[PDB]
RNA sequence: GGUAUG
RNA sequence: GGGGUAGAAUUCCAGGUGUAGCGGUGAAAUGCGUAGAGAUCUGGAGGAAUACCGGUGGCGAAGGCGGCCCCCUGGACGAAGACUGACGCUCAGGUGCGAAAGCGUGGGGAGCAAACAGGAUUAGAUACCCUGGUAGUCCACGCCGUAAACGAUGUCGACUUGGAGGUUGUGCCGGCGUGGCUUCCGGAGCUAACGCGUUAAGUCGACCGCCUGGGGAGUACGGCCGCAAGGUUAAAACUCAA
């Protein structure tokens, strides 16, 4: 009968979901700031943050311009998140850095 | 709708009576339109549309004959 | 048309008590309005049912 | 001004009706008022219950009268707790013919 | 128990669920059975079939009261309107009266906003 | 509106007959009565805007009739505005 | 149940 | 405009019965429930709104106006007369009325619901969906003065083939007329066309309001109004070749 409150006591600690924010090589400053405010909000709630960077076409041939962005995000989210994964290579046409709450 | 079951009449017949009783009283049609709020402009809009459609019948059920 | 004349009024209500449209009963518009007021006065005095 | 006062009475106090009638109809004639009709229909079945009651005692008074006396009749009906329900209509003319 | 003999089957047929309460003629509850208690979950509750099953489980909860005649008081627009009644007949109870008792509000209260779905 | 009696008084008092309903004097008198009566109504019923529009048509229609009479015959005008107790 | 992008 | 009143429904409260779900969605979960919910019955409290009738029906200057009853009150129309004797039409400025939201003070608060909280959905979802929920929605008084406030069509008058309806009078012998309002179709004519078409966007006359490429802009400045929100009057530079 009293499973009702047991189920509640289970649910009262949240399951960590993974929120995805997707950048591009040429994401401009103001738009970057919006996405960063998104990530700050996600990590302060205790959610993981699968940050992706999608290359398109011949932007593939300038990988480091992308890598710069992911490095920038890591640095900005340094006193808040910890890098659970950093991309070495372009897998497909993407580079996935998982952050996670401290 | 107060379909009281009469003497020596089967259940299925009495249930058809209960349907025709409700379907004419229009109880289910009433409940549907009271499920959500329709602001007066929307009510009037539909009422005019129904009238134009009803009119468009009379000048096409005739107007052809 | 009389609110007290329940026998006449009973011809213009349904089983459930609702007033019958003039499109159905073929009543003239002036009388349908008199009839409606009659039925509504009857209902207040409890000479006709509102419902059921 | 050609009214038509119906009123229903709590069917226990059907005893009180012919006395109550007089008290009202006296106040009408007290100020010049005709009584073109008075039809006690008596005890009838209410088409729905009114404060428990399943029957009540109806009375119909077609009355020419001034306005002030009709106003006083309304205050009486309000306080007289034997009277469950009242309706003061207006009519255009006097009605003397019998109603069902 | 008191062998009720004649009782009342109130069918609350909403769009989502179907409650079936069997009461005495004075409207005291004997036993009840919802479509959501009959295994069906989510929008399988809101089926004619789940109403059929809910009736049957209610029928088998008022076995002890040995009812024979029933008054059926259907209320609401749900799929489990007729389905519930057909089940009560086949369950053995004789149906004396079937009445729609769906509330209409003679105007009254402002309904919730339309779903923009 | 005025009662049939209240009307027929005013028609007799200001007319040159009981046929004489048309006269400007009668017309102004009738309007002045009904205007005066309604001052009661609008003290109580201050938000009866729809009725007040009817009142202003009476005030307006009177002003016009008076201005007609003032230029048609000044003697008749002066008497009438004292009989009815009108400023102008 | 949202038919993101050939 | 005022006052009264009725039935239905929703919520809440108190009981009775009853027992494990209810609720909700595309699917869920939040929520509610063993301190007994939901369902059902009885009684009470309270607020708001008036099913059917109900109609391209009616009334109103427009905004708008829908239970019933009374009270106070405005306008419209017809029938015959009788009366006044051009007393008329229009109207810058002016004055008033003016949906909703909003504002002030004080009431009220069922339902609903901006904001908001939570649950979801999603790449994200500051939304749509779900559970809640405050202002507000209601009343009084005062303010505000705006809306696709629309017929996107100023007011008044006259004239100009028809058809089918609706509604409300009335005359005459179901028929035959004759007024008011109104829906639809269409002729001439008009119109860029769409369409309008005796309720004109036709043919004319009176008076008023308004327009003069797009954007900038119904913005700035100034004035007036407003407690405020703002409203009203209302530019220009510039840029485009639409
Ligand atoms: C269902 C989505 O519909 C609309 O977006 C559509 C987009 O999803 C594609 O189907 C095409 O680009 C269409 O041309 C777009 O209109 C747009 N209103 C956003 C909606 N999506 C969501 N609200 C959502 O995914 O969530
Ligand atoms: K009383
Ligand atoms: K002037
Ligand atoms: K609230
Ligand atoms: K063409
Ligand atoms: K320019
Ligand atoms: K200004
Ligand atoms: Mg009109
Ligand atoms: Mg009137
Ligand atoms: Mg308001
Ligand atoms: Mg306020
Ligand atoms: Mg809500
Ligand atoms: Mg909501
Ligand atoms: Mg404007
Ligand atoms: Mg319109
Ligand atoms: Mg305009
Ligand atoms: Mg004018
Ligand atoms: Mg046309
Ligand atoms: Mg033109
Ligand atoms: Mg401005």
Write the layout of secondary structure elements.
The structure is cut from a larger assembly and holds chains A (102 residues), B (65 residues), C (52 residues), D (100 residues), E (117 residues) and F (88 residues).
Chain A: H1 3-11, E1 18-23, H2 29-44, E2 48-53, H3 63-76, E3 81-83, E4 96-101
Parallel strand pairs in A: 1-2
Antiparallel strand pairs in A: 2-4, 3-4
Chain B: E1 2-4, H1 11-25, H2 27-33, H3 40-61
Chain D: E1 3-9, H1 17-29, E2 39-50, E3 53-63, H2 67-79, E4 83-90
Antiparallel strand pairs in D: 1-3, 1-4, 2-3
The complex binds the ligand C[C@H]1O[C@H](O[C@H]2[C@H](O)[C@@H](O)[C@@H](O)[C@H](O)[C@@H]2O)[C@@H](N)C[C@@H]1NC(=N)C(=O)O, potassium ion (6 copies) and magnesium ion (MG) (13 copies).
The structure holds two RNA strands.
Subcellular location (chain A): Cytoplasm
Protein name (chain A): Translation initiation factor IF-3
GO molecular function (chain A): ribosome binding; RNA binding; translation initiation factor activity
What do these coordinates show?
Chain B is mainly alpha-helical and 65 residues long. Chain B has three helices and one strand; from the N terminus they run E-H-H-H. Chain B has one domain. The longest helix of chain B has 22 residues. Chain B starts with a strand and ends with a helix. Chain E is α/β, with parallel strands linked by helices. In chain E, helix 1 runs parallel beside helix 2. The N and C termini of chain E lie far apart (49 Å). Chain F contains four helices and no strands. The longest helix of chain F has 24 residues. The relative contact order of chain F is 0.13. The chains are: A alpha+beta (102), B mainly alpha (65), C mainly alpha (52), D alpha+beta (100), E alpha/beta (117), F mainly alpha (88). At the B-E interface, strand 1, helix 1 and helix 2 of B face helix 2 and strand 5 of E. Chain E binds two RNA strands through strand 1, strand 2 and strand 3.
Q: How many helices of chain B in DSSP terms?
A: 3
Chains forming the largest contact = B-E, 23 and 21 residues
Task: Report the strand count of chain F.
Answer: 0
CA radius of gyration of chain B: 19 Å
Largest sheet entry of chain B: none
Helix proportion of residues of chain F, in percent?
over 70%
Distinct bound molecules: ligand KSG, potassium ion, magnesium ion
Question: Per the principal axes of the C-alpha atoms, what is the gross shape of chain B?
Answer: flat
The helix/strand series of chain F, from N terminus to C terminus, equals: HHHH
Give the percentage of residues in beta strands of chain B: under 5%
Protein name (chain B): Small ribosomal subunit protein bS21
GO cellular component, one term (chain B): cytosol
Pfam families (chain B): Ribosomal_S21
Region (Disordered) (chain B): 42-65
